[PDB]
Amino acid sequence: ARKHIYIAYTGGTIGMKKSVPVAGFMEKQLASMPEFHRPEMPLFTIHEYDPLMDSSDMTPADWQLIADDIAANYDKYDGFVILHGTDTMAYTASALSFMFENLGKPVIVTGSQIPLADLRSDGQANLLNALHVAANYPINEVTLFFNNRLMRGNRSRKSHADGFSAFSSPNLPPLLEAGINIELSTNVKVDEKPSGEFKVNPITPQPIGVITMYPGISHEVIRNTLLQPVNAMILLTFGVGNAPQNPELLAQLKAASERGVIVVNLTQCLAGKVNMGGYATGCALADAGVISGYDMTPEAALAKLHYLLSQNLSYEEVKAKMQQVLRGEMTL
Amino acid sequence: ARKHIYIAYTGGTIGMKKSDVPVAGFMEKQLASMPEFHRPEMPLFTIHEYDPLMDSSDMTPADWQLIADDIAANYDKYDGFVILHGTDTMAYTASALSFMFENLGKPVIVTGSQIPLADLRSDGQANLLNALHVAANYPINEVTLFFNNRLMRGNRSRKSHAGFSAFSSPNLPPLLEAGINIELSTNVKVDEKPSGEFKVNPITPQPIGVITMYPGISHEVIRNTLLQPVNAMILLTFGVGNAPQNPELLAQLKAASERGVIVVNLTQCLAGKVNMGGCALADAGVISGYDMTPEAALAKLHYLLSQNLSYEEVKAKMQQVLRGEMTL
Amino acid sequence: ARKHIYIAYTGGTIGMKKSDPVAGFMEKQLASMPEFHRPEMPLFTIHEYDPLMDSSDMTPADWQLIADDIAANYDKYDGFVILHGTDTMAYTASALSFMFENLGKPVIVTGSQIPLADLRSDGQANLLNALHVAANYPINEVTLFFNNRLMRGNRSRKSHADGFSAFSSPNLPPLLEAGINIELSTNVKVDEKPSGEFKVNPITPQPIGVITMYPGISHEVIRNTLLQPVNAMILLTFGVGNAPQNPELLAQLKAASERGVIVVNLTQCLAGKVNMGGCALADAGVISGYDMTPEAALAKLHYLLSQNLSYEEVKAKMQQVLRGEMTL
Amino acid sequence: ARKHIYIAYTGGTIGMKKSDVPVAGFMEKQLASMPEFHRPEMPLFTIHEYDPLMDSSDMTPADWQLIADDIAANYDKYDGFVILHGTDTMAYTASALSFMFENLGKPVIVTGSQIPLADLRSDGQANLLNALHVAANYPINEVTLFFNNRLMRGNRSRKSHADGFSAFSSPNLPPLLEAGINIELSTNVKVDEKPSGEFKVNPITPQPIGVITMYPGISHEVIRNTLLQPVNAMILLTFGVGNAPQNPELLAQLKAASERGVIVVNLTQCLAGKVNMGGYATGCALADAGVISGYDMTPEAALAKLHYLLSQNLSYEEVKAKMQQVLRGEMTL
Catalytic status, residue B212 = no
Judgement on whether residues C128 and C190 belong to the same structural domain of the protein: yes
User: Which of D205, D237, D269 represents a domain boundary (last residue)?
Assistant: D205
Query: Neighbouring chains of C at 3+ CB pairs within 8 Å?
Result: B, D
Please tell me which residue of chain C has the smallest CA distance to D96: C215
Q: Is residue C195 domain-shared with residue C250, that is, in the same domain?
A: no
In this structure, the strands spanning D80-84 and D108-111 are: parallel
**How many domains does chain B fold into?**
2
Rounded distance, CA C307 to CA C301, Å?
Answer: 10
Q: How far is C297 from chain D (nearest CA, A)?
A: 11
Whole-angstrom distance, CA of residue B127 vs CA of residue B146: 7
CA distances from B50 to B25, B55, C69 (A): 10, 11, 53
Strand partners, A199: A101
* Chain A residues with CB within 8 Å of chain D CB: 33-35, 38, 40-41, 113-114, 119-120, 122, 125, 128-129, 132, 163-164, 179-181
Residues D274 and D332 in one domain: yes
B268, A158 contact by CB (below 8 A): yes
- Which of D163, D187, D205 is the last residue in one of the domains? D205
Q: Binding site membership of B for substrate: which residues?
A: 56, 87-88
- What is the three-state SS of chain C? CCCEEEEEECCCHHHECCCCCECCCHHHHHCCCHHHCCCCCCEEEEEECCCCCCHHHCCHHHHHHHHHHHHHCCCCCCEEEEECCCCCHHHHHHHHHHHEECCCCCEEEECCCCCCCCCCCCHHHHHHHHHHHHHHCCCCCEEEEECCEEEEHHHCEEEEECCCCEEECCCCCCCEEECCCEEECCCCCCCCCCCCCCEECCCCCCCEEEEECCCCCCHHHHHHHCCCCCCEEEEEEECCCECCCCHHHHHHHHHHHHCCCEEEEEECCCEECCCCCCCHHHHHCCEECCCCCHHHHHHHHHHHHHCCCCHHHHHHHHCCCCCCCCCC
Closest Cα of chain D to A289: distance in Å? 47
Q: How far is it, in rounded angstroms, from Cα D310 to Cα D318?
A: 10
Same domain, A329 and A255: yes
Instruction: For the beta carbon of residue A1, count every other beta carbon within 10 angstroms.
Output: 3
Q: Is the CB of A224 less than 8 angstroms away from the CB of B221?
A: no
DSSP-assigned letters across all residues of A80-136:
EEEE--STTHHHHHHHHHHHEES--S-EEEE--SS-TTSTT-HHHHHHHHHHHHHHH
Interface of B to C at Cβ within 8 Å reads 34-36, 39, 41-42, 114-115, 120-121, 123, 129-130, 133, 163-164, 179-181
**Out of C160, C206, C269, whose CB is closest to D159?**
C269
Q: Is C263 helix (H, G, I), strand (E, B) or coil?
A: strand
Which of A58, A207, A216 shows the shortest C-beta gap to B220? A207
- H/E stretch holding A303: helix A298-309
Distance from the Cα of B13 to chain A's closest Cα (Å) equals: 13
Residues A156 and A8 both lie in one domain: yes
Tell me: do A18 and A35 sit in the same domain: yes
- Residue A40's domain is classified under what CATH number? 3.40.50.1170
Instruction: Report how far apart the first and last C-alpha atoms of chain B are (Å, whole number).
Output: 40
Q: What residues are paired with B9 via a beta bridge?
A: B49, B84
CB contact under 8 A, D62 and C216: yes
B144 is catalytic: no
Residue B252 DSSP SS3 = helix
DSSP output for B59-103: --HHHHHHHHHHHHHHTTT-SEEEEE--STTHHHHHHHHHHHEES
Half-sphere exposure of C220 (CA within 13 A, CB side): 11
D196 with D275, same domain: the answer is no
Residue A130 bridge partners (DSSP): none
Same domain, C84 and C198: yes
Residues 6+ away with beta carbon under 8 Å from D163:
C240, C271, C272, C273
Q: Domain span at residue A57? A: 1-204
Pairwise CA distance, residues B258 & D275, whole Å = 68
Solved with = X-ray
Residues D100 and D63 in one domain: yes
| D56 is annotated as contributing to ligand binding | yes
Q: Are strands C157-161 and C166-168 parallel, antiparallel or unpaired?
A: antiparallel
- Domain end call among A187, A204, A221: A204
| Neighboring chains of B (3 or more beta-carbon pairs < 8 A) | A, C
CATH number at residue D280: 3.40.50.40
Residue A295 CB contacts under 8 Å (≥ 6 apart), including other chains: A171, A267, A271, A272, A273, A274, A330, A331, A332
8 Å CB contact of B133 and C122: no
Cβ–Cβ under 8 Å, residues A134 and D143 = no
- D120·A132 Cβ contact <8 A: yes
C150 and C209 belong to one structural domain: no
Are residues B180 and B217 located together in one domain of the fold? no
Query: Residues D78, D7: contact at Cβ < 8 Å?
Result: no
Consult the annotation and say whether C55 binds a ligand: yes
- Residues linked to residue C233 through DSSP beta bridges, in sequence order: C209, C263
Contact in structure between C88 and D245 (CB atoms under 8 Å): no
Q: How far apart are CA A142 and CA B39, in angstroms?
A: 59
Q: Is D296 marked as a binding-site residue?
A: no
- Resolution (angstroms) stands at 2.5
Q: State the catalytic residues of C.
A: 13, 86
- In eight-state DSSP terms, residue A192 is P
Do D236 and D188 lie in one domain? The reply is no
